[PDB]
Design a protein around this ligand. Structure first.
Ligand SMILES: [Ca+2]
Ligand SMILES: [Ca+2]
Ligand SMILES: [Ca+2]
Length: 899
């Protein structure tokens, strides 16, 4: 905390009559004019007004003197004290009481040498300690206080309607803040890094936040404020939230990490807006070159969703040994972040852990300035960056807290069907202000200031990475109901730029962070996400502008946009893709990959795809001639875009720049989408640039979670029984020997956790495959059970058991029939005939015997010649689908029957 800003603000005019402002030097403190010599314009000044406040140290009497009292008029509280050294005029001042200062200073010829300020109680020189800043909040929007730009001047003058001491014509035309002074902005300064500020010449607080435009653009704010918030247009505004790092869960109410019966799982905060985008159906080659994304559940980033990885081998309810009706105590480790731009002070957030889809609460905690800090800085975090995360019981003011859920919900959380959201309340806190000395002092409730800022601005969120701290920004916009507001109007690009303190690089906006891994955020490089209302306002605007990019639309009060960073991004511009030429051009950037008339470019090192995530791939294409019609394909395939994967067949190219986009769910086969690539085949060349790849949320591994057991099979049905299933609503679908049955819903588990899926119109056991179908999407299957012809072969062969032999009443050493048990009809209609060889002789073929209920029988008189078998014959039996079914020797030991 430097506090160099505290002091006399001074207005340096070039002429002798306070009329052509040149610069506004802040924070002068005793040796006047000296701080301002850093301006190359300083020795050309002939009139200077200072304004500020003087602290009177001890009670008593002071005589006030200067260097060139000849050319100084000095009022304090309006009363003239020096007037070209025509009075010595004594002043009785009280101790610890402050007084307004107005110094004017003029020389009809000669530049002014520096100016000095002197004490006395009987000389001396005024310590910088007792020289303070003009009270900015109350010289703001009042009358009959005295003005910063008064026309009289006391020996055509600037107007400043606000009294935030930024002239009207400056707030409109543009200014900046270079060398701790405010100067009118000329475009040179942009190459030095200076930003072009504009603001409202009629409100002192354009974006309605605690500091006047001047305090913001200068520095009269807390030191922990993001540089962003110096722009009159982006607000000082906090975003305190809390993400979860570890989730522990015990069988007993003593859920503390490091303990018997206390399992501990790791977790990661993820922005909820993006994790609730439902992919859609894919756009593939269309004009009006922009994509877009809508979230239903658009969530401000002070409200984290929590991600869990189901690496685990076994359900967590089994991991601790609790059953259906026993409860599972649990506890967690968390970290508080401030995604905002302003430090919040004396905070007290109460925080709600909820289920995403059935908005049920789990628990609540309230944290005090004793449990977390006195304050939370902008972009800071408690516990700090290198530190371990504090525990729920260490966070909650009221100590530990019983948190119990059942086995059902606890395994749904592992499986990811219940996402665990952490909404945390914004109302309690305090903004900082600069005092007399230059250290933060709590200055007021944040709650009314937040409602006022939100009223007058839009909402911009940079969600970089599913584990990294987001940025919550608010940028003012016009008041559309007022046909006279002078809040400056800016496009989306200008707002994104201002919101994130982003810089240019070949016209390419880009965001540089503290981990210094810079990111391109111009429209083709990121992925935008809005709610429903902003979609309409954007699309309403882009029907009236034929050069249509989202970044061009006028930025309107009440919008909500989220920037989402791609996971692979090919901007053809460096030192890449196979069979493609770098060349020179580009949608954005400098170069712009191209392929030929059969040209078949693919990607060197394309992205890492996950087993049940869904992705979006976007590209920018043109023809490289006028009209030269060619036919493109854009794919994410394992065979150049010929099945298993995702192609978009591009029937439309001629001339200008167009988007081409497709989305897919890698659904138990990420490998099917290994390679991104463009095939061209037509009249002209093919240009393209800015290929991007966007990641959208993993789902439950349907195949992994199914576990199989047994095959079931008078009763006329086939059924597949599962011990474990996934916890998601799914469907099933049979493949009966190539043909695919209707999609059917999941049957309900009964008793045990057993689900069994079945097939009805079955007459003879045939090879079958059971597919698990996605809940909503009919084209997302996965095999979960299969019945193959070598298994059926085994079932047929076992379904033939031996009932007994048939001897004769009339001679009981002669046998006459072999009988098996009747087969069940689902099996028997699968045999067509039998073959029987008795006494190794001729292999007779006989038709399917008609069961005489309880057992089928073949006779032996005739495959054995005419002799009723031999007491020791060999009987062999086949049944064709041929399949040896029994091979047996007639023994006196076996079951026998007679007639
Ligand atoms: Ca002003
Ligand atoms: Ca203003
Ligand atoms: Ca480029």
């Amino acid at each position: 905390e430097q506090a160099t800003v505290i002091g006399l603000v001074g207005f340096y005019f070039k002429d002798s009559t306070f009329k052509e402002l040149m610069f506004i030097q802040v924070g002068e403190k005793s040796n006047l004019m000296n701080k301002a010599r850093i301006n190359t314009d300083a020795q050309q000044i002939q009139s200077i007004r200072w304004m500020g406040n003087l602290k009177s140290p001890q009670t008593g009497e002071y005589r006030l003197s200067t260097s060139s009292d000849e050319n100084v008029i000095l009022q304090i509280n309006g009363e003239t004290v020096i007037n070209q050294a025509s009075i010595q005029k004594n002043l009785k001042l009280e101790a610890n009481q402050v007084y307004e200062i107005k110094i004017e200073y003029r020389n009809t010829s000669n530049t002014l040498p520096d100016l000095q300020l002197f004490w006395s109680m009987n000389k001396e020189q005024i310590p910088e300690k007792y020289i303070l800043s003009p009270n900015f909040s109350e010289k703001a929007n009042s009358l009959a206080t005295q003005s910063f730009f008064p026309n009289y001047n006391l020996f055509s003058t600037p107007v400043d309607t606000d009294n935030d001491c930024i002239p009207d014509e400056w707030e409109e035309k543009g200014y900046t803040f270079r060398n701790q002074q405010i100067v009118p902005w000329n475009d040179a300064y942009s190459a030095e890094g200076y930003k072009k500020y504009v603001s409202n010449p009629y409100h002192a607080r354009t974006v309605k936040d605690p500091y006047t435009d001047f305090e913001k653009v200068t520095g009269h704010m807390p030191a922990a404020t993001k540089y962003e918030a110096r722009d009159p247009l982006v607000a000082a505004y906090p975003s305190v939230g809390v993400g979860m790092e570890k989730l522990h869960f015990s069988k007993n109410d003593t859920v503390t990490e490091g303990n018997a019966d206390t399992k501990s799982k790791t977790t990661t905060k993820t922005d909820t807006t993006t994790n609730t985008v439902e992919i859609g159906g894919s756009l593939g080659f269309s004009d009006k070159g922009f994509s877009f994304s809508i979230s239903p559940k658009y969530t401000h980033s002070w409200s984290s969703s929590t991600s869990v990885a189901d690496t685990d081998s076994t359900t967590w309810s089994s991991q601790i040994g609790i059953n259906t009706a026993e409860r599972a105590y649990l506890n967690a480790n968390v970290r508080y972040y401030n995604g905002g731009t302003a430090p919040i002070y004396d905070l007290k957030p109460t925080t709600n852990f909820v289920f995403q889809n059935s908005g049920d609460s789990i628990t609540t905690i309230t944290a005090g300035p004793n449990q977390i800090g006195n304050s939370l800085g902008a972009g800071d975090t408690y516990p700090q960056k290198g530190q371990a995360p504090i525990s729920l019981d260490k966070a909650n003011e009221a100590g530990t807290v019983k948190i119990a859920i059942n086995a059902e919900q606890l395994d749904k959380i592992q499986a990811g069907t219940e996402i665990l959201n952490i909404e945390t309340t914004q109302n309690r806190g305090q903004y900082g202000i600069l005092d007399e000395k230059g250290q933060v002092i709590p200055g007021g409730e944040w709650d009314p200031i937040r409602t006022n800022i939100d009223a007058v601005s839009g909402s911009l969120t940079l969600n970089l990475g599913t584990g990294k701290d987001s940025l919550e920004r608010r940028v003012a916009a016009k008041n559309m109901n007022d046909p006279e507001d002078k809040t400056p109007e800016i496009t989306i690009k200008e707002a994104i730029k201002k919101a994130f303190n982003a810089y240019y690089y070949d016209g390419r906006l880009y965001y540089t962070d503290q981990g210094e891994k810079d990111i391109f955020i111009d429209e083709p490089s990121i992925n935008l996400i809005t709610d429903e209302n902003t979609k309409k306002e954007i699309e309403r605007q882009l029907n009236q502008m034929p050069g249509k990019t989202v970044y061009d639309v006028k930025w309107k009060r009440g919008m909500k946009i989220t920037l989402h960073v791609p996971i692979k991004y090919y901007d053809f511009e460096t030192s890449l893709w196979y069979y493609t030429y770098q060349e020179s051009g580009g949608y954005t950037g400098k170069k712009r990959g191209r392929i030929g008339t059969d040209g078949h470019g693919t990607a060197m090192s394309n992205p890492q795809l996950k087993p049940y995530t869904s992705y979006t791939v976007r590209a920018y294409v043109r023809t490289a001639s006028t009209t030269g019609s060619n036919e493109v394909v854009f794919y994410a395939d394992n065979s150049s875009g010929n099945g298993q994967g995702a192609k978009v067949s591009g029937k439309v190219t001629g001339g200008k720049w167009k988007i081409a986009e497709f989305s897919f769910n890698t659904f138990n086969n990420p490998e099917y989408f290994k390679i991104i690539g463009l095939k061209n085949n037509g009249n002209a060349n093919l240009h393209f640039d800015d290929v991007s790849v966007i990641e959208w949320k993993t789902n439950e591994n349907l195949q992994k979670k199914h576990i199989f057991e047994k095959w079931s099979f008078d009763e006329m049905v086939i059924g597949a029984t599962f011990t474990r299933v996934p916890s998601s609503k799914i469907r099933y679908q049979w493949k009966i020997n190539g043909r695919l049955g209707s999609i059917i819903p999941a049957p309900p588990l009964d008793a045990n956790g057993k689900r069994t899926v079945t097939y009805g119109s079955i007459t003879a056991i045939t090879p079958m495959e059971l597919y698990a179908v996605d809940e909503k999407n009919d084209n997302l299957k996965v095999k979960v059970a299969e019945l193959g012809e070598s298994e059926i072969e085994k079932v047929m062969i076992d379904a033939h058991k031996f009932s007994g032999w048939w001897y004769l009443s009339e001679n009981p050493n002669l046998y006459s029939g072999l009988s098996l048990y009747k087969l069940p009809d689902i099996f028997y209609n699968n045999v067509s005939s039998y073959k029987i060889r008795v006494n190794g002789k001729k292999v007779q073929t006989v038709s399917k015997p008609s069961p005489f209920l309880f057992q089928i029988t073949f006779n032996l008189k005739n495959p054995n010649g005419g002799t009723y078998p031999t007491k020791d014959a060999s009987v062999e039996l086949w049944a064709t689908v041929d399949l040896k079914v029994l091979h047996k020797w007639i023994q006196k030991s076996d079951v026998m029957y007679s007639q």
